[PDB]
Design a protein around this ligand. Structure first.
Ligand code: 8GB
Lengths: 340, 14
Protein backbone atom coordinates (compact mmCIF):
# COMPACT_ATOMS: atom_id res chain seq x y z
CA UNK A 1 0.00 0.00 0.00
CA UNK A 2 2.57 2.57 1.05
CA UNK A 3 4.77 1.16 -1.73
CA UNK A 4 1.99 1.50 -4.34
CA UNK A 5 1.57 5.10 -3.10
CA UNK A 6 5.31 5.67 -3.64
CA UNK A 7 5.16 4.28 -7.18
CA UNK A 8 2.29 6.70 -7.81
CA UNK A 9 4.37 9.63 -6.50
CA UNK A 10 7.21 8.70 -8.86
CA UNK A 11 4.72 8.48 -11.74
CA UNK A 12 3.25 11.91 -10.93
CA UNK A 13 6.61 13.64 -10.55
CA UNK A 14 7.82 12.18 -13.80
CA UNK A 15 4.82 13.73 -15.56
CA UNK A 16 5.24 16.99 -13.63
CA UNK A 17 8.88 17.31 -14.78
CA UNK A 18 7.92 16.68 -18.42
CA UNK A 19 5.26 19.41 -18.19
CA UNK A 20 7.63 21.79 -16.40
CA UNK A 21 10.42 21.37 -18.96
CA UNK A 22 8.10 22.08 -21.88
CA UNK A 23 7.19 25.43 -20.26
CA UNK A 24 10.74 26.17 -19.04
CA UNK A 25 12.02 26.26 -22.62
CA UNK A 26 9.41 28.83 -23.57
CA UNK A 27 1.82 39.56 -22.12
CA UNK A 28 0.01 42.79 -20.97
CA UNK A 29 0.62 46.47 -20.17
CA UNK A 30 0.10 48.70 -17.18
CA UNK A 31 -2.87 50.71 -18.49
CA UNK A 32 -4.80 47.46 -18.83
CA UNK A 33 -5.34 47.53 -15.05
CA UNK A 34 -6.89 49.80 -12.44
CA UNK A 35 -4.73 49.94 -9.31
CA UNK A 36 -6.84 49.51 -6.19
CA UNK A 37 -4.77 49.10 -3.02
CA UNK A 38 -1.34 48.14 -1.69
CA UNK A 39 -1.40 44.57 -0.26
CA UNK A 40 2.22 44.38 0.89
CA UNK A 41 5.59 46.05 0.52
CA UNK A 42 9.30 45.21 0.29
CA UNK A 43 12.64 46.93 -0.26
CA UNK A 44 12.24 46.81 -4.10
CA UNK A 45 8.53 47.67 -4.44
CA UNK A 46 5.02 46.62 -3.59
CA UNK A 47 2.25 44.19 -4.33
CA UNK A 48 -1.01 45.86 -5.33
CA UNK A 49 -4.51 44.63 -5.83
CA UNK A 50 -5.44 45.58 -9.39
CA UNK A 51 -8.55 45.16 -11.54
CA UNK A 52 -8.24 44.15 -15.18
CA UNK A 53 -10.26 46.82 -16.99
CA UNK A 54 -11.64 44.60 -19.78
CA UNK A 55 -12.53 41.46 -17.80
CA UNK A 56 -13.01 42.98 -14.34
CA UNK A 57 -11.05 40.14 -12.74
CA UNK A 58 -8.90 40.98 -9.75
CA UNK A 59 -5.18 40.21 -9.54
CA UNK A 60 -2.17 40.79 -7.29
CA UNK A 61 0.46 42.82 -9.20
CA UNK A 62 4.04 42.79 -7.92
CA UNK A 63 5.84 46.00 -9.04
CA UNK A 64 9.64 46.12 -8.87
CA UNK A 65 11.45 49.42 -9.43
CA UNK A 66 14.15 48.40 -11.91
CA UNK A 67 16.39 51.07 -10.40
CA UNK A 68 15.92 49.74 -6.86
CA UNK A 69 16.84 46.22 -8.10
CA UNK A 70 20.45 47.48 -8.05
CA UNK A 71 22.75 44.84 -6.53
CA UNK A 72 23.96 41.92 -8.70
CA UNK A 73 22.17 39.20 -6.76
CA UNK A 74 19.00 41.30 -6.77
CA UNK A 75 18.69 41.27 -10.64
CA UNK A 76 19.47 37.52 -11.23
CA UNK A 77 16.86 36.63 -8.62
CA UNK A 78 14.21 38.68 -10.42
CA UNK A 79 14.81 36.70 -13.61
CA UNK A 80 14.63 33.43 -11.64
CA UNK A 81 11.33 34.43 -10.07
CA UNK A 82 9.53 35.20 -13.38
CA UNK A 83 10.84 32.15 -15.26
CA UNK A 84 10.16 29.71 -12.44
CA UNK A 85 6.63 31.04 -11.79
CA UNK A 86 5.66 30.89 -15.47
CA UNK A 87 6.69 27.20 -15.64
CA UNK A 88 5.44 25.62 -12.38
CA UNK A 89 1.98 24.17 -11.77
CA UNK A 90 0.97 22.81 -8.35
CA UNK A 91 -2.17 23.27 -6.17
CA UNK A 92 -0.38 25.26 -3.46
CA UNK A 93 1.71 27.57 -5.74
CA UNK A 94 0.40 30.96 -6.79
CA UNK A 95 -0.46 31.21 -10.48
CA UNK A 96 1.31 33.87 -12.58
CA UNK A 97 -0.97 35.23 -15.29
CA UNK A 98 0.96 38.11 -16.87
CA UNK A 99 4.38 39.68 -16.84
CA UNK A 100 5.65 42.78 -18.62
CA UNK A 101 7.96 45.72 -18.11
CA UNK A 102 8.16 49.41 -18.90
CA UNK A 103 10.74 52.19 -18.68
CA UNK A 104 10.84 52.11 -14.87
CA UNK A 105 9.37 48.89 -13.48
CA UNK A 106 8.99 45.15 -13.82
CA UNK A 107 5.51 43.70 -13.30
CA UNK A 108 4.32 40.20 -12.39
CA UNK A 109 0.54 39.77 -12.29
CA UNK A 110 -0.64 36.80 -10.20
CA UNK A 111 -4.01 35.44 -9.13
CA UNK A 112 -5.32 37.35 -6.12
CA UNK A 113 -5.52 35.26 -2.93
CA UNK A 114 -8.02 37.13 -0.74
CA UNK A 115 -7.71 35.33 2.62
CA UNK A 116 -4.57 37.23 3.66
CA UNK A 117 -1.15 36.15 4.90
CA UNK A 118 -0.77 33.31 7.31
CA UNK A 119 1.46 35.79 9.17
CA UNK A 120 -1.31 38.14 10.24
CA UNK A 121 -3.74 35.34 11.21
CA UNK A 122 -1.01 33.68 13.32
CA UNK A 123 -0.02 36.91 15.02
CA UNK A 124 -3.67 37.73 15.77
CA UNK A 125 -4.56 34.34 17.30
CA UNK A 126 -1.13 33.68 18.89
CA UNK A 127 -0.49 30.10 17.85
CA UNK A 128 -2.13 27.31 15.91
CA UNK A 129 -3.04 23.99 17.56
CA UNK A 130 -0.99 21.06 16.35
CA UNK A 131 -3.68 19.67 13.94
CA UNK A 132 -4.03 23.15 12.42
CA UNK A 133 -0.28 23.60 12.01
CA UNK A 134 -0.09 20.05 10.61
CA UNK A 135 -2.65 20.80 7.90
CA UNK A 136 -0.52 23.71 6.65
CA UNK A 137 2.79 21.86 7.10
CA UNK A 138 1.51 18.96 4.95
CA UNK A 139 0.92 21.36 2.04
CA UNK A 140 4.43 22.77 2.32
CA UNK A 141 5.90 19.24 2.42
CA UNK A 142 4.10 18.36 -0.82
CA UNK A 143 5.07 21.68 -2.38
CA UNK A 144 8.75 21.20 -1.58
CA UNK A 145 8.57 17.59 -2.83
CA UNK A 146 7.30 19.00 -6.13
CA UNK A 147 9.79 21.87 -6.32
CA UNK A 148 12.80 19.82 -5.30
CA UNK A 149 11.97 17.15 -7.86
CA UNK A 150 12.37 19.91 -10.48
CA UNK A 151 15.71 20.89 -8.90
CA UNK A 152 14.11 24.09 -7.59
CA UNK A 153 15.03 25.46 -4.19
CA UNK A 154 12.51 27.89 -2.66
CA UNK A 155 14.71 29.69 -0.05
CA UNK A 156 12.19 32.09 1.59
CA UNK A 157 9.71 30.02 3.57
CA UNK A 158 7.98 32.07 6.29
CA UNK A 159 4.35 32.93 7.25
CA UNK A 160 4.58 36.30 5.44
CA UNK A 161 4.81 34.38 2.14
CA UNK A 162 1.93 31.92 2.72
CA UNK A 163 -1.48 33.20 1.65
CA UNK A 164 -4.75 31.53 2.69
CA UNK A 165 -7.22 30.93 -0.13
CA UNK A 166 -11.01 30.82 -0.04
CA UNK A 167 -10.99 27.12 0.84
CA UNK A 168 -8.51 27.63 3.68
CA UNK A 169 -5.59 26.11 1.80
CA UNK A 170 -2.12 27.61 1.33
CA UNK A 171 -0.79 29.46 -1.69
CA UNK A 172 3.01 29.99 -1.65
CA UNK A 173 3.98 33.40 -3.03
CA UNK A 174 7.16 35.33 -3.56
CA UNK A 175 9.56 33.28 -5.61
CA UNK A 176 12.18 36.05 -5.40
CA UNK A 177 14.81 33.65 -4.03
CA UNK A 178 13.71 30.52 -5.82
CA UNK A 179 16.40 28.94 -8.03
CA UNK A 180 17.22 25.91 -10.15
CA UNK A 181 20.10 24.23 -8.34
CA UNK A 182 21.21 20.74 -9.33
CA UNK A 183 23.80 20.46 -6.56
CA UNK A 184 25.00 23.41 -4.45
CA UNK A 185 24.53 27.14 -4.58
CA UNK A 186 26.33 29.93 -2.74
CA UNK A 187 24.19 33.16 -2.44
CA UNK A 188 23.80 34.47 1.03
CA UNK A 189 20.05 35.17 1.00
CA UNK A 190 16.71 34.53 2.75
CA UNK A 191 15.17 35.75 6.01
CA UNK A 192 17.32 35.70 9.18
CA UNK A 193 15.04 33.61 11.43
CA UNK A 194 14.57 30.94 8.73
CA UNK A 195 18.23 30.56 7.53
CA UNK A 196 19.90 27.20 7.85
CA UNK A 197 23.30 27.25 9.62
CA UNK A 198 25.18 26.39 6.47
CA UNK A 199 23.82 29.53 4.76
CA UNK A 200 24.98 31.70 7.66
CA UNK A 201 28.40 30.00 7.65
CA UNK A 202 29.02 30.89 3.96
CA UNK A 203 29.05 27.20 3.02
CA UNK A 204 27.76 25.99 -0.32
CA UNK A 205 24.33 24.52 0.36
CA UNK A 206 21.52 22.58 -1.32
CA UNK A 207 17.76 21.98 -1.07
CA UNK A 208 18.08 20.75 2.52
CA UNK A 209 17.93 24.41 3.54
CA UNK A 210 14.23 24.29 2.70
CA UNK A 211 13.72 21.37 5.09
CA UNK A 212 15.45 23.31 7.87
CA UNK A 213 13.13 26.21 7.11
CA UNK A 214 10.11 23.90 7.32
CA UNK A 215 11.19 23.05 10.88
CA UNK A 216 11.32 26.77 11.70
CA UNK A 217 7.86 27.27 10.17
CA UNK A 218 6.23 24.35 12.00
CA UNK A 219 7.78 25.52 15.30
CA UNK A 220 6.55 29.12 14.71
CA UNK A 221 3.05 28.00 13.76
CA UNK A 222 2.73 25.76 16.85
CA UNK A 223 4.49 28.08 19.35
CA UNK A 224 3.63 31.52 18.00
CA UNK A 225 7.27 32.53 17.67
CA UNK A 226 10.22 30.96 15.88
CA UNK A 227 12.92 28.85 17.53
CA UNK A 228 15.83 31.30 17.06
CA UNK A 229 14.35 34.57 18.30
CA UNK A 230 16.28 37.80 18.99
CA UNK A 231 16.02 41.53 18.25
CA UNK A 232 18.98 41.76 15.87
CA UNK A 233 20.03 39.49 12.96
CA UNK A 234 23.53 38.85 14.34
CA UNK A 235 21.99 37.51 17.60
CA UNK A 236 19.61 35.32 15.59
CA UNK A 237 22.54 33.93 13.56
CA UNK A 238 24.42 33.07 16.79
CA UNK A 239 21.43 31.10 18.09
CA UNK A 240 20.99 29.26 14.76
CA UNK A 241 24.64 28.21 14.60
CA UNK A 242 24.68 27.05 18.21
CA UNK A 243 21.60 25.11 17.10
CA UNK A 244 20.31 24.67 20.64
CA UNK A 245 16.51 24.48 20.46
CA UNK A 246 14.15 24.60 23.41
CA UNK A 247 10.48 23.80 23.01
CA UNK A 248 7.27 25.04 24.69
CA UNK A 249 5.97 22.65 27.28
CA UNK A 250 2.73 22.18 25.30
CA UNK A 251 4.54 20.69 22.24
CA UNK A 252 3.82 17.00 21.88
CA UNK A 253 6.72 14.58 22.01
CA UNK A 254 6.06 13.60 18.39
CA UNK A 255 6.34 17.27 17.33
CA UNK A 256 9.60 17.77 19.21
CA UNK A 257 11.05 14.62 17.62
CA UNK A 258 10.14 15.81 14.11
CA UNK A 259 11.53 19.25 14.81
CA UNK A 260 14.79 17.91 16.21
CA UNK A 261 15.29 15.98 12.95
CA UNK A 262 14.50 19.02 10.76
CA UNK A 263 16.39 21.61 12.81
CA UNK A 264 19.46 19.38 12.49
CA UNK A 265 22.83 21.11 11.91
CA UNK A 266 24.44 17.87 10.63
CA UNK A 267 23.42 17.47 6.98
CA UNK A 268 24.10 13.74 7.11
CA UNK A 269 21.25 13.55 9.67
CA UNK A 270 18.72 16.18 8.56
CA UNK A 271 15.33 14.84 7.55
CA UNK A 272 14.55 15.51 3.94
CA UNK A 273 18.24 15.02 3.07
CA UNK A 274 18.69 11.30 3.75
CA UNK A 275 18.43 8.12 1.69
CA UNK A 276 14.63 8.07 2.02
CA UNK A 277 14.32 11.77 1.11
CA UNK A 278 10.96 13.37 1.84
CA UNK A 279 9.50 10.10 3.04
CA UNK A 280 11.30 10.37 6.39
CA UNK A 281 9.08 13.41 6.91
CA UNK A 282 5.87 12.04 5.38
CA UNK A 283 6.15 8.80 7.40
CA UNK A 284 7.00 10.52 10.68
CA UNK A 285 4.62 9.81 13.56
CA UNK A 286 3.58 13.50 13.80
CA UNK A 287 2.05 13.11 10.32
CA UNK A 288 0.45 9.68 11.01
CA UNK A 289 -3.07 11.15 10.70
CA UNK A 290 -2.22 12.96 7.45
CA UNK A 291 -3.82 11.63 4.27
CA UNK A 292 -1.22 12.94 1.85
CA UNK A 293 -3.26 12.25 -1.31
CA UNK A 294 -6.39 13.86 0.18
CA UNK A 295 -4.43 17.00 1.02
CA UNK A 296 -3.13 17.22 -2.55
CA UNK A 297 -6.63 16.70 -3.89
CA UNK A 298 -7.94 19.33 -1.43
CA UNK A 299 -10.47 16.89 0.08
CA UNK A 300 -9.64 17.68 3.74
CA UNK A 301 -11.80 20.26 5.50
CA UNK A 302 -9.62 23.24 6.44
CA UNK A 303 -9.28 24.42 10.06
CA UNK A 304 -9.99 28.00 9.13
CA UNK A 305 -11.94 29.56 6.25
CA UNK A 306 -11.45 33.34 5.83
CA UNK A 307 -14.51 35.49 5.43
CA UNK A 308 -14.82 37.16 2.04
CA UNK A 309 -17.20 40.05 1.42
CA UNK A 310 -17.01 39.77 -2.37
CA UNK A 311 -14.50 40.04 -5.19
CA UNK A 312 -11.81 42.60 -4.56
CA UNK A 313 -12.33 42.44 -0.79
CA UNK A 314 -9.09 43.43 1.02
CA UNK A 315 -10.39 43.11 4.60
CA UNK A 316 -7.95 40.25 5.39
CA UNK A 317 -4.88 42.44 4.62
CA UNK A 318 -3.13 45.14 6.62
CA UNK A 319 -3.08 48.78 5.39
CA UNK A 320 0.07 50.28 3.81
CA UNK A 321 1.08 53.77 2.72
CA UNK A 322 0.19 54.35 -0.94
CA UNK A 323 2.74 55.98 -3.29
CA UNK A 324 1.88 56.89 -6.89
CA UNK A 325 3.37 54.70 -9.62
CA UNK A 326 5.64 56.95 -11.76
CA UNK A 327 6.94 55.76 -15.12
CA UNK A 328 9.93 57.69 -16.50
CA UNK A 329 10.14 58.98 -20.08
CA UNK A 330 13.63 57.41 -20.12
CA UNK A 331 14.00 53.61 -20.11
CA UNK A 332 16.08 52.51 -17.15
CA UNK A 333 18.30 49.42 -17.10
CA UNK A 334 17.18 48.12 -20.49
CA UNK A 335 20.22 45.93 -21.13
CA UNK A 336 20.17 44.37 -17.65
CA UNK A 337 16.52 43.28 -17.97
CA UNK A 338 16.46 42.11 -21.62
CA UNK A 339 15.54 38.50 -20.74
CA UNK A 340 12.55 39.58 -18.57
CA UNK B 1 12.48 36.31 25.07
CA UNK B 2 12.78 39.60 23.13
CA UNK B 3 12.56 39.05 19.37
CA UNK B 4 11.14 40.42 16.15
CA UNK B 5 7.35 40.31 16.14
CA UNK B 6 6.52 42.24 12.93
CA UNK B 7 7.01 41.36 9.32
CA UNK B 8 10.55 40.20 8.49
CA UNK B 9 12.40 41.42 5.38
CA UNK B 10 14.55 39.05 3.43
CA UNK B 11 18.23 39.78 2.98
CA UNK B 12 19.74 39.53 -0.49
CA UNK B 13 23.53 39.53 0.04
CA UNK B 14 24.54 39.66 3.73
C1 8GB C 1 -1.18 36.53 -4.97
C2 8GB C 1 -1.33 37.48 -3.83
O1 8GB C 1 -2.47 37.77 -3.41
C3 8GB C 1 -0.11 38.12 -3.25
C4 8GB C 1 1.15 37.89 -3.79
C5 8GB C 1 2.27 38.41 -3.16
CL1 8GB C 1 3.86 38.12 -3.84
C6 8GB C 1 2.15 39.17 -2.01
C7 8GB C 1 0.90 39.46 -1.48
C8 8GB C 1 0.82 40.19 -0.19
CL2 8GB C 1 1.76 39.33 1.08
C9 8GB C 1 -0.24 38.94 -2.11
O2 8GB C 1 -1.47 39.19 -1.59
Amino acid sequence: KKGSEQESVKEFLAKAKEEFLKKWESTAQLDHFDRIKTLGTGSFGRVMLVKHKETGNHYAMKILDKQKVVKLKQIEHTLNEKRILQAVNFPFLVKLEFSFKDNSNLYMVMEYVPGGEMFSHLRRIGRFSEPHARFYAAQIVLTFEYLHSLDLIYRDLKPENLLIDQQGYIQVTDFGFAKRVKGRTWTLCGTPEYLAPEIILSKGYNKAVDWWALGVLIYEMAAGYPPFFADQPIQIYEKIVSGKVRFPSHFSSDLKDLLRNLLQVDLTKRFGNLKNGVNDIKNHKWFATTDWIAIYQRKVEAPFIPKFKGPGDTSNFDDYEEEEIRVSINEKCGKEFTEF
Amino acid sequence: AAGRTGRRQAIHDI
